[PDB]
Design a protein around this nucleic acid. Sequence first.
DNA 1: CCCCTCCC
Lengths: 73, 75, 74
Amino acid sequence: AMGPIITTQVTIPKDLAGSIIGKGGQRIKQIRHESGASIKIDEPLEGSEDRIITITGTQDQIQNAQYLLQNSV
Amino acid sequence: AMGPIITTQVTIPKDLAGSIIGKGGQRIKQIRHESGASIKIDEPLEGSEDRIITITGTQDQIQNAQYLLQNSVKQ
Amino acid sequence: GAMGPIITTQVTIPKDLAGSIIGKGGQRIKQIRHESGASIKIDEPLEGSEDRIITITGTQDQIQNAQYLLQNSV
DNA sequence: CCCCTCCC
């Protein structure tokens, strides 16, 4: 059972965002295709050190994506 | 034919660095993406009004980057 | 009227052209470094390639001086 | 205008 598409957000220290994205964005593109989740990384907010990541998919896809995001860091 | 990855440095007056970087760094992000060069702007340094920019890529990337840098300041 | 930071610039040259920069017994390049005051290093050609990288280190003036002298060599 | 493996 897939269940519904849901959206989850988390923040990431901006210092660490390059690890999830990777040179030429390869690593995030890989995370999106492997997990099947939509993954958005916002620009860092106004004078702040947090960057919001939005993950959208079934619960499994989102749990898949959270692991792949962890393994990146 | 891309050729070797090389590094060039130039300086800018520190009072011009804002035009290049942009609010929340958006302009410089755009310049890196578009030229495909790595572009690093150093902090202040200590005492002086010059700020070093390091550009790394193929010769075309670096030339592409130098135009986009100039386009940021001029306009 | 103000020298500024020592900075580094690289440019490539066709390998077939490097003899002109160097001179017999490395004398033209020696002359280029003393003249401009820039430090100038020419790498060995990278594998499978026609290009040699030249690294010039100095202030902006020294580097521009060196870039002219390199050009006048060719 | 202050970013920084920078993707969409």
